[PDB]
Nucleic acid binder design. Structure first.
Ligand SMILES: [Mn+2]
Ligand SMILES: [Mn+2]
Ligand SMILES: [Mn+2]
Ligand SMILES: [Mn+2]
Ligand SMILES: [N+]
Ligand SMILES: [N+]
Ligand SMILES: [Zn+2]
Ligand SMILES: [Zn+2]
Lengths: 180, 368, 368, 180
DNA sequence: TGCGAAATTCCATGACA
DNA sequence: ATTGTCATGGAATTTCGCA
DNA sequence: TGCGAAATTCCATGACA
DNA sequence: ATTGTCATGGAATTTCGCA
């Protein structure tokens, strides 16, 4: 068998709904399987059309051989199927209700929640920095960050500070206050 | 004047007037019988005025001025006096063209890494497409890998919106651009400092300086044109197609696509190269690092037979940028403070401001 | 297709496929183990489609197209097939630039006599001066002697009014101009025939063809500019001054003023040459006739290392004149009917009309 | 003494008033002394200003050393004197009431009268052809026309036909009718 | 250790401003 | 205070296939 | 039948379109 | 059915002034 490579498999999923930020409610999450590199796209709905609109941007830069997703409605539509077929992307579904990617999605959910508190509405603007953080975050398994693995170089934004990522005392109380 | 010309009439020797010709008075003037004919020798005190009247008839250069004078006059070293005036004619100095070419171009080193340097520029205006008129073109210096963003204007704000989307991926050390309103605004300066990005500017009116992106503009328009043949010029929907298409095209001289130079592996696009199928990613990246260092680098070409290179304290003139009709193409003379490189200088512009300037927008002031 | 590829799999020899490599079946396709790697050999029947898909990704030329294909395929003489498609891509043919330069310029003979030929052209629009915006410039081919007339428009009517004033002096054999509205109108044609004047036209969009007047425009603007330095651009009152000034300026290479070439004697203007004071008019004119025949004539320069010269029945393409944004710079291919001279041709433009055309507005269609 | 040359002396004079042609009444006549070459300019008056306006055109092509005229008011004004001085033109006057030139002026008066009849009002348009005629007219004294002498070449409009120049029967009667 | 043809490399030309 | 670039397609040169 | 300096000629560069 | 041109000012080359 041939070694795992970037663009072999993209893992996509939605996160939301979230509080309205500049008209957006959801986040399409794309994680490259081999590298752990993450792309994020704000959408207004977890719909096939919002998925195609966002993936069109991404697939303008690089095209996966396989896309993997859960059986969300946006991903199982035959519009989305037609879209993938047009680009020679094979579609791959985890069976309903059932590694490196899983951890990354945890990091994303958690890191969002952290910064989403105090400013639940300003997240749109924060997406770029969230990605940069995620992608220059050191992987304990591999000696490298996703940036390094994607591009074969060090980055000009190293996140030397690994952070709490955990919710402090002031935040737990004002997250219990916002969601009232 | 009347002093020098006196000793001459009696037949003694003065330096400059050859002793073998006969000099005489007639009609109230000193004359002399030269092979070409009889010419009047004016007193030294009259000569500047003469050269001047001659030159002013049509503001003519060396020979064409001299030939007017030689019709009536002779004196020693006439051209020296002609050249003296040409050198002091404000109007000739700022209106005439140069006849010395720039020194041979530099071929600066390729940025060592992706994201070391971006070149950015706007294309447009273009025929309206979905209310859009411009394209922001961002070109990675090392890879050539290019990002395209449609905009409504070549504004700072639209620049920032696009670069926020792009810098989601990575942040560059440097971003190089021309001195357009959109990149020189303080708002853009702040946006860059905010992120640790250094702003680099091209010397004014010298797009050669950001030649990488200018050149990429050519491919962008060329391919849009072909894809638009016999259809209405709806380019908006094609930006993504063009971007991808170009990022995955081989440069014959390099034998690589910008995509490969950026990722060291093709994505799922037609005709993906498969040569590194059996290597581990890590082996792949190691071969990439090697490929990146060994790329072809052009060398500086031969100087043209009549070029000039700038010397400190030389008088030079900057070309007027958008000269009005019937107005001079050159600014008044100015001084070279510093020679940054053989093709770039700092001049004190007689106002006087320090301006950094390409030698292509310069001529060496004539007649010292 | 399946015929040729069959004999190959068993191990017999086919012309083009080198016998020393091993060819095999796998995954349902014919393969082959080449130094670079394992490539699929498509059936002859599949090859055109492949070349086409490759070329269409970014409409790339020979090598950049080939490198895409070679990623997956091998077959004999791949480039021959690549070149076949490039030659049939309408879009590449009309959009790409040429990379062969025109042949070396002609230096036509100087008209033998004053009034043999006039070159005429308009300058402008210029900043308004007394309600005038253009200058009609008439240049005598033999002498360079130039007449200037201010006009309100580059119209036929203003052309006729001016030329009536000028032809009071003498009538020319020929008048050469560009294909502007003002000189191609029937009204102007009639005005010329009425007088025994032959109209000569430059090939379209090639002012080099009337280079004499174009060049004289440069001096006219240059001198107006100098005389107008730091004053408002009131050029109307200076036309007469400029005309005179230029007509009486020496060309360093000829050693004559156009005035002298026209009259063989200076008039009462500053620095009048007096060399022929003692000759009779008739002796003067005889020396003039001699001066006119012996003027310097430039020779045709060396061809650039990669020029083309037109051959009858060659496919060539005319440059689009005022191409719209994102539209091709070249017309569809067309055929050379006649080679008038090495720099001028008649083409049948596929409409098809006979057009006379400069090779500078032409490229030789690529890939035969 | 040095031989006679073109531009040595211009002989100017007015002819008129004439019938209105396109707003013009007079003709300034300039004849080069040596060559017999003639220039004509329509004016609205025999004034110094009309003379300077017209001579400015001519002196844009070639400048005489001397201008000769009768003592017409237009030529004896100090404006006209100032004008000449500015251009290094010496002025020369025939004494009040008192060769090749004289004959030329006769030719001009006569040739005008000829063509002026039948169309007394269309003369403005005819000035160019009148000059061309005058200037390609063979001189019995010299072997040459003024054109030949001016430019040292043959012309593309030779007037091989020397004409009556005299007033025919139909014209004498309709000149005696127009001036009624 | 050399030949004819194919493959590859060279590089002038022109177009982005 | 900064700096030309590179697709293109014939020609020139090198390499390949074969003895 | 030769030297130093002045004069003249050569010619690349650029701008008219 | 038509076609580049020529002012410019340093450098290169020729000529001049003198022995
Ligand atoms: Mn889901
Ligand atoms: Mn009178
Ligand atoms: Mn640009
Ligand atoms: Mn023109
Ligand atoms: N460099
Ligand atoms: N010719
Ligand atoms: Zn001047
Ligand atoms: Zn194509």
């Amino acid at each position: 068998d041939r070694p795992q490579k970037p663009f072999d498999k993209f893992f996509i999923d939605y996160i939301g709904p979230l509080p309205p930020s500049q008209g957006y409610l959801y986040v399409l999450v794309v994680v490259d399987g081999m590298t752990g590199f993450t792309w994020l796209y704000p959408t207004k709905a977890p719909s096939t059309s919002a998925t195609v609109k966002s993936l069109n941007v991404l697939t303008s830069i690089a095209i996966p051989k396989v896309i993997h997703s859960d059986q969300g409605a946006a991903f199982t539509s035959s519009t989305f199927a037609e879209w993938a077929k047009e680009r020679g992307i094979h579609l791959e579904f985890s069976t309903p209700y059932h590694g490196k990617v899983e951890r990354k999605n945890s990091d994303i959910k958690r890191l969002l929640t952290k910064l989403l508190v105090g400013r639940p509405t300003k997240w749109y603007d924060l997406l770029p920095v969230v990605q940069l953080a995620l992608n220059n975050t050191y992987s304990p398994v591999l000696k490298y960050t996703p940036h390094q693995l994607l591009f074969g170089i060090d980055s000009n934004t190293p996140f030397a500070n690994q952070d709490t990522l955990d919710l402090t005392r002031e935040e737990e109380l004002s997250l219990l206050q916002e969601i009232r | 004047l009347d002093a020098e010309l006196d000793q001459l009439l009696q037949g003694h020797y003065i330096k400059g007037y050859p002793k073998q010709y006969t000099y005489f008075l007639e009609d109230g003037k000193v004359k002399v019988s030269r092979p070409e004919g009889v010419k009047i020798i004016p007193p030294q005190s009259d000569r500047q005025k003469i050269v001047l009247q001659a030159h002013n008839l049509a503001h003519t250069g060396r020979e064409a001025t001299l030939l007017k004078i030689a019709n009536l006059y002779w004196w020693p070293n006439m051209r020296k006096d002609v050249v003296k005036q040409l050198g002091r004619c404000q109007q000739c100095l700022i209106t005439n063209a140069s006849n010395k070419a720039s020194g041979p171009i530099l071929r600066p080193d390729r940025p060592q890494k992706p994201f070391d340097k971006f070149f950015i520029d706007y294309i447009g205006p273009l025929p309206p497409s979905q209310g859009y008129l411009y394209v922001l073109v961002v070109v990675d210096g090392m890879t050539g890998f290019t990002w395209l963003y449609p905009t409504k204007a070549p504004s700072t704000s639209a620049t920032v919106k696009s670069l926020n989307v792009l810098t989601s991926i990575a942040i560059p050390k440097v971003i190089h651009s021309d001195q357009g309103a959109a990149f020189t605004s303080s708002t853009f300066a702040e946006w860059a400092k905010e992120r640790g990005i250094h702003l680099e500017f091209s010397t004014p009116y010298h797009p050669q300086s950001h030649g990488k992106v200018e050149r990429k503009n050519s491919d962008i328009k060329r391919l849009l044109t072909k894809l638009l043949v016999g259809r209405p010029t709806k380019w908006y929907d094609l930006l993504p197609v063009v971007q991808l298409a170009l990022n995955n095209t081989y440069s014959p001289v390099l034998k690589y696509t910008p995509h490969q130079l950026l990722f060291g592996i093709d994505s799922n696009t037609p005709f993906a190269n498969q040569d590194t199928l059996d290597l581990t990613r890590e082996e792949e990246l190691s071969l990439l690092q090697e490929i990146r260092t060994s790329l072809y680098h052009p060398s500086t070409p031969p100087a043209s037979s009549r070029s000039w290179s700038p010397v400190v304290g030389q008088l030079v003139q900057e070309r007027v940028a958008r000269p009005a009709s019937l107005r001079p193409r050159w600014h008044k003379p100015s001084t070279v403070l510093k020679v940054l490189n053989p093709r770039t200088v700092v001049i004190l512009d007689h106002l006087g401001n320090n301006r950094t300037v390409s030698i292509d927008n310069l001529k060496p002031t004539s007649h010292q």
